[PDB]
Amino acid sequence: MGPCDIYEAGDTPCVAAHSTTRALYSSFSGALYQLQRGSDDTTTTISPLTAGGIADASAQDTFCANTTCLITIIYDQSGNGNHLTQAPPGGFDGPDTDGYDNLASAIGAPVTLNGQKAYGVFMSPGTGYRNNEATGTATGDEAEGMYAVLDGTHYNDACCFDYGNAETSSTDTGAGHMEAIYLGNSTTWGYGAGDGPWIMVDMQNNLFSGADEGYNSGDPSISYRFVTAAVKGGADKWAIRGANAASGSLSTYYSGARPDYSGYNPMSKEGAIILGIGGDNSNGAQGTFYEGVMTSGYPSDDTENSVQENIVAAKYVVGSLVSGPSFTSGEVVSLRVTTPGYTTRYIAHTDTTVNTQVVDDDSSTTLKEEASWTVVTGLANSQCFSFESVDTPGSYIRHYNFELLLNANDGTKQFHEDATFCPQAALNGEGTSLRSWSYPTRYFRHYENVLYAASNGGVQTFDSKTSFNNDVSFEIETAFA
Ligand SMILES: *[C@@H]1O[C@H](CO)[C@@H](O[C@@H]2O[C@H](CO)[C@@H](O)[C@H](O)[C@H]2NC(C)=O)[C@H](O)[C@H]1NC(C)=O
Numbered sequence: 001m002g003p004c005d006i007y008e009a010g011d012t013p014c015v016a017a018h019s020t021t022r023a024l025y026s027s028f029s030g031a032l033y034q035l036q037r038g039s040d041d042t043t044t045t046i047s048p049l050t051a052g053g054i055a056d057a058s059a060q061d062t063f064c065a066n067t068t069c070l071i072t073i074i075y076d077q078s079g080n081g082n083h084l085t086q087a088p089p090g091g092f093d094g095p096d097t098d099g100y101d102n103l104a105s106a107i108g109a110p111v112t113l114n115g116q117k118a119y120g121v122f123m124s125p126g127t128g129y130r131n132n133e134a135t136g137t138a139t140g141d142e143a144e145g146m147y148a149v150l151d152g153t154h155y156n157d158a159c160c161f162d163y164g165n166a167e168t169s170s171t172d173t174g175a176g177h178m179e180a181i182y183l184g185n186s187t188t189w190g191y192g193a194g195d196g197p198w199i200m201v202d203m204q205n206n207l208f209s210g211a212d213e214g215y216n217s218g219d220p221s222i223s224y225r226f227v228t229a230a231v232k233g234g235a236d237k238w239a240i241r242g243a244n245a246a247s248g249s250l251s252t253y254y255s256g257a258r259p260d261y262s263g264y265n266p267m268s269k270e271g272a273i274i275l276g277i278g279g280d281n282s283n284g285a286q287g288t289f290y291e292g293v294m295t296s297g298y299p300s301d302d303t304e305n306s307v308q309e310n311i312v313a314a315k316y317v318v319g320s321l322v323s324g325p326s327f328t329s330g331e332v333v334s335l336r337v338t339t340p341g342y343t344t345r346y347i348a349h350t351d352t353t354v355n356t357q358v359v360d361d362d363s364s365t366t367l368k369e370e371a372s373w374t375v376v377t378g379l380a381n382s383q384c385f386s387f388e389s390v391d392t393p394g395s396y397i398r399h400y401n402f403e404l405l406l407n408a409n410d411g412t413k414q415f416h417e418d419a420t421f422c423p424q425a426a427l428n429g430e431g432t433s434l435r436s437w438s439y440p441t442r443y444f445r446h447y448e449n450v451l452y453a454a455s456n457g458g459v460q461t462f463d464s465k466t467s468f469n470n471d472v473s474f475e476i477e478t479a480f481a
């Protein structure tokens with residue numbers, strides 16, 4: 001029995017079932033998600049390897065070889081047609097074409113499920129998915145449940161990393177017009193104990209950590225790499241439950257009446273589905289989604305408990321973010337350009353500007369140090385790396401407005417995330433490509449001999465698809481200094 005079989009047995013069946021990692025019904029053998037690759041802009045689907053099984057990650061790796069991939073569609077396994085696609089503009093514009101939100105990388109969230117590789121949905125600020133034409137989802141004050149398995153360590157405080165029920169117009173239509181899982185450390189509305197992040201419920205114009213606006217002591221900080229968030233709502237009742245998705249049981253952090261503020265009882269749900277964004281298209285949040293569902297009816301605690309036991313049995317474990325030659329902490333390197341016409345250039349810097357320059361044995365010692373990089377444990381991810389200046393110790397290559405700058409580590413989460421890069425076997429086969437940990441659609445990329453965190457196509461000039469594979473491939477050489 002998969003999660004949706006368990007919900008059905010509790011007479012609260014799934015009406016939307018979304019996962020890039022696995023089938024959520026024991027008999028589902030259809031497509032889990034759609035990929036689009038940058039090389040030819042064509043698509044393919046990824047299905048489970050067996051009915052009721054795990055995503056064919058090998059088929060993704062094959063399709064995405066020597067290029068970049070985006071997850072274009074997360075299919076609804078339930079048969080209701082509630083597929084998640086690129087989220088449209090609403091109250092807020094996204095940063096993509098026509099104010100759409102960005103699609104996620106296919107490769108930002110590698111995992112294993114019982115030892116088998118799969119890929120989650122790693123969502124950087126400005127990423128979002130939606131279905132405003134959803135069928136079967138609860139509306140008005142009708143009962144529903146939902147859950148998601150999320151990365152409890154990938155979050156921020158911006159509005160809003162949500163999964164669940166939202167407005168069909170992509171605008172704020174008032175209190176009670178949403179009911180979605182939220183994960184992050186926003187303290188604009190609700191928050192819990194400790195420093196966050198918190199699972200809360202987005203009910204529109206409020207993230208609730210419980211019955212009260214603001215602080216609720218019973219909502220703990222999440223301390224799990226894989227978190228099961230289970231949320232449910234019915235007629236003047238709702239709940240927040242949380243578990244380590246890798247071990248043990250759901251605990252209940254809120255259960256009872258709707259918050260006693262105008263507009264939350266009865267609810268006015270609209271039945272649209274969102275992922276990674278707020279109901280009005282607020283698109284500042286980040287997070288990672290692995291699997292989740294929405295149901296018809298208010299699930300029992302027992303049904304949710306059987307779902308959690310199923311999740312634990314799936315055995316989520318962190319996967320490898322790194323491929324290709326890679327690095328050791330304390331190694332000093334120079335990174336040589338491989339693009340035809342520029343192959344004598346190395347990644348260097350002039351003060352804060354990271355650039356490419358011709359560097360050779362006759363260059364000034366000043367330039368040799370500027371073309372030399374101390375590789376250290378990733379500031380935001382210990383599998384990945386950060387690139388420390390030899391001439392300016394304590395300063396690292398970071399992205400800022402998607403340009404690579406050499407800036408001093410200020411100890412902030414923002415800097416750490418901006419300064420962390422995951423080596424990948426070079427897209428042209430010549431050395432390494434350095435993928436942004438925080439924006440895995442983007443890579444170290446030279447454009448007019450300046451370094452950017454560029455995507456393979458996009459809204460910035462330096463996201464040009466011309467020479468992309470070459471422009472993101474660098475040979476790892478002995479440091480000049
Ligand atoms: C969410 O958690 C982050 C990470 O701890 C908090 O980050 C701090 O932001 C302040 C300014 O608001 C900086 O001066 C600190 O250096 C930050 N700390 C780190 C470690 O980056 C953030 O404040 C939290 N957000 C809210 C709303 O509480």
Ligand SMILES: O=[N+]([O-])c1ccc(O[C@@H]2O[C@@H](CO)[C@H](O)[C@H]2O)cc1
Nearest residue numbers: 160172204205206207278279280282
């Ligand atoms: O007035 N504002 O500054 C403002 C901006 C965004 C905003 O977002 C709404 O409130 C969030 C919390 O419920 C929901 O996800 C979103 O639709 C709610 C209020």
Ligand SMILES: O=[N+]([O-])c1ccc(O[C@@H]2O[C@@H](CO)[C@H](O)[C@H]2O)cc1
Nearest residue numbers: 398399400401402403414418438453
């Ligand atoms: O132009 N701005 O007002 C502006 C706002 C935010 C901003 O964020 C920076 O740009 C992001 C992308 O490189 C990094 O994650 C962050 O440090 C960079 C620039």
Ligand SMILES: O=[N+]([O-])c1ccc(O[C@@H]2O[C@@H](CO)[C@H](O)[C@H]2O)cc1
Nearest residue numbers: 339342446447448449450466467471
């Ligand atoms: O308008 N231009 O002057 C101009 C010239 C070259 C050019 O190519 C880019 O710059 C080259 C070197 O960084 C990269 O290989 C390529 O993406 C991009 C723009």
Ligand SMILES: *[C@@H]1O[C@H](CO)[C@@H](O)[C@H](O)[C@H]1NC(C)=O
Nearest residue numbers: 065066425426427428429430
């Ligand atoms: C594709 O990338 C792999 C890994 O770097 C490499 O071995 C292979 O040579 C590349 N092929 C092409 C056509 O670039």
